[model samples]
Target: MEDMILTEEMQKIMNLIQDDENNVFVTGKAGSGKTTFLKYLIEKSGKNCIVAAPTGIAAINAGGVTLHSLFGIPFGPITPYDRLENKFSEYKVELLLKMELLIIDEISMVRPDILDTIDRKLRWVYESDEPFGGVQVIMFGDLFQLPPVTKKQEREILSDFYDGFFFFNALVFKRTGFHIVELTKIFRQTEPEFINVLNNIRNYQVTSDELDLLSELKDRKISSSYDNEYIHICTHKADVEKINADKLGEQEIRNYDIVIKDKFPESSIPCDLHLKLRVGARVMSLVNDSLKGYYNGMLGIVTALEDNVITVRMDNGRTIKFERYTWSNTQYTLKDNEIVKEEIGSCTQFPLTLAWAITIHKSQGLTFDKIIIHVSHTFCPGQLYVALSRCRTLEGIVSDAFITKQMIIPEYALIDFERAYKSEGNYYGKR
Candidate 1:
C-alpha cells in the first residue's frame, strides 16, 4: 500500500471525519487533490468505504464503485425521488445502514433535488429518524465548472431541499452539520503565466498590465499554413481521406482515423447539435439534479439498450447502476391494443459527447502528454490559451498555427499581478 502524505488541507478534513460527527463539503479548483485526500482519510479510518463519482470514467479512474449504481437509478423507471414501496423491507434498510462512509465526488454537477432525494431515501431505509440515516457524507467538486442545466420547477424545488439541508438550522432527529474545507494549492500548471489567468478568473479582477502582455502576443507573425498539421473544424468524411495523407504514414496517429469518422457530424439537429452520443460510448458528466436522473451527463459508458432506457456508468466508476432516457421531441403510446405514434417528434437525443475532443473546462484537472489544439477564428483568446496550457512539456504541443500574443492573453486576463508582486515583497520584508 502506498503511504499517503497529508497536507494541511487534508489534515483539516481528516480531523472532521475522525470525530465522526459532521458532513464535510470539500471544495477546490481543479487539480487541488481533494479526491486523493479523502481516499486517504477513508483508508486511515478503516471504514467500509463507498466512494462514488458523478460519472463512470471518474469512478473507474478512482477505482471505486459509482454513485448511480449505489442509488439504483437505471434498470427501471425508478429515480431517487421515488418513494420506496418496500420501505419496511429489512434487507434493503440493512444495506443503507451498513455504509460507514459515503464519499461523493463531482458534487458541483449534482443538483439540490438529487441531494434531497438521496436524503429522503436514506432516512426511509435506516428508520432512525436521523437525517440521511446516519451516513457520514463527504462531497468534493468545484462549483464553478457548471451548474444544473435545466430550468424546470421541480428542479428548483429540489434546490430548495438542498439549501435547507445544508442551511444553518434544520431540525432533524439526528443532528448533522456541514463542514467546509477548501483546497488552495494548485498542482497542475508549471508556468506562472498560465496560473495567473486562472487566478484572475477566481478573483474576478483583470489588470491593464496583464491585458497589455496578452495583447502583445496577438501581433507576432508566424507561418500561416501547417504542412503536416491541420486545423480540422468541419470537413466532409469523403474529402477527409485525401487530406489525411500526411498522418497516414504513422500507425499510432493513423489510428485516430477511426475516431474522426465516429465523431464526424453529418447533419444538424437542434437538441443533438450541442451533444453527440453513440451507443456504448463512455462520457464525462456535466450535471446532476432531481429533475434529471442520476449520472446526468457525468462520464459513464452506455451499458445497455432497451425500450428507450439507456444504462450508463455513474461517476463512482460503477457500471450500469443508473438508466437515463434518451432526449425525445416526440411521443408515442399504445392504443386499441396497438402502439402508435401520436405525433412525429423532432428527434430523440442524448447529452453531447465531445468524443476524443474534450471541453476546456474538464481539461483543467488533467495533464496531457500530447495536446493538439484546433482553434478557429470564432474562438476567443481565453479558449485558446486554456487549451494550450494543459500540456506538461513544450514537446507535447502540436499546434496548427504558430503561437501569438492573443493566445497568451485572455479577455478576462489577470489584473492583480502588481498587487500579488507587492504582497510577496512586503511579506518577505516583514519576515
Candidate 2:
C-alpha cells in the first residue's frame, strides 16, 4: 500500500493514534476524506487492529466485519451483560485477547445500549477495569449524517438504559473518556459560500439568508430527456424501488439471471442477485475493478449483454467488459495469537447493481455525478443534508422539497454535539 499524503490536521490525529494513549472519535463533514484517512490507518498502523461497522453494507464498504459479528452480540436487547462471555468461542477469545486497536466506522449509527454492552463484554473477557479490555478505540463518523436506528420495542429497551439513542449518550463513553478530532476543511465543494451554508446547516445554526439560498432550489427538477442517467435519491425505500422499477419498465429489456456458483449469506451479498438489464439501462459497479477503470461509485450504461459477459459504456466513452466477481464473507480468527481475517464463504456474481435511484440511507458513503432528491416530506434529522451532499457540486442537486430551518435541526443531536465538543476541549486541544 502507498503511504498517504497527510494534511496538517491529519498528522496531528495520526500522532495521537500512534501514541495509543487516548480513545479518539474521528469526525468530519460529508466529504472530508474520513474514509481515506481510515484506509491509511489500516495500511500503516502495523498494530493488530480490527475494523468494524454497525451494518453489513457499511462493514463491506469499509473492508471490515460487522460489529455484531466481531463481538458475537445478538440483535435484541442485551440484558445481563455478564452472560456475553459465553457467546465467544475459544478461537474468538484468542482473537479478542490479541486485539490492540478497534476501529469503528459510521459510529453515528451505533446505539448507546450496544456500545455499553460491548464495554461490558470487553471488560469481562479481558479481566481489566480499563475500558474496552484496555484496547485503544478509534471511531469515525459524522454526527450530522445519520442517527442510531431503534424500533418501538428496541427504543423502550434502550430508554431503560440511555437518555438518548446516540452513542455519545452511552455510559461507557462517559466513564472511559475520549478525545474528539473534528476535520474542518471542506474538499468536496469548491465554493466557499456553499461550504459555509452547509456547515451552518450541519451545526444547526442556519441563517435566514442561507435558508433563502437553498429555498431557490425547492421546486427544482432535473429534466429526464437527457441520455445521461442521474441517480434519484429519496428518504423511503419504496420510493427508490418505484423509481428504479419505472425506469426499468420504460426500457426494452431482458432479465439476466446471475449464476451463483457459491451461495453467500444474506449479510455478504451487497446487491440483488437476480438482475434485469437493458441495452441502455444505467448501472453501477458494486465492487472496485481498478484495472478496468470501474470502482464502487463508478456509473455506466449497458451497451450490450451476452451469455455470461456484460459490456458497459462508461461516462468517458470507454467500453469495458465485466465477468463474475467474487465477494468474500470474512470473519476474524486467531492465527498463532495474532488476529487474522478468515474467509468463511464466498459469492461469485456480477458486481453491478441498477442505479436509476437509491435510498438516502443506502447512499451514505457514495459520491454521485448528479442527484435528484425526491422526498415528499423530510422527517429525519440529517436526511436532507445527507441527500444533498452526495453530489459533488451545488449545480448537481435537484430537489422538490422546501428547505426549512426547523427541518434541518434535531435538538437532541445538537445537545449531544455540544457535550462532545466541550469534552474534547477538556481532554485535548479544541477541534
Go through the candidates in order and give the clash count of each: 32, 0
Candidate RMSDs in order:
15.0, 3.0
Q: How many angstroms is residue 64 displaced in model 1 relative to the true structure, after the best TM-score fit?
A: 2.3
Per residue, candidate 1 scores C-alpha lDDT tens digits across 147-201 of 3244565445444434321212123312454666778666545555556755553
Instruction: Judge candidate 1 at residue 411 and give its lDDT.
Output: 34
Top-TM-score candidate index: 2
lDDT of each: 0.47, 0.74
Model 1 vs. true fold: TM: 0.53
Q: Encode model 2's per-residue lDDT on 87-171: one tens digit a residue.
A: 7887777788888999999998897777877888888789999778889889999867667557888877667667777777777
Candidate 1: what lDDT? 0.47
Weakest 10 consecutive residues, lDDT, candidate 2? 219-228
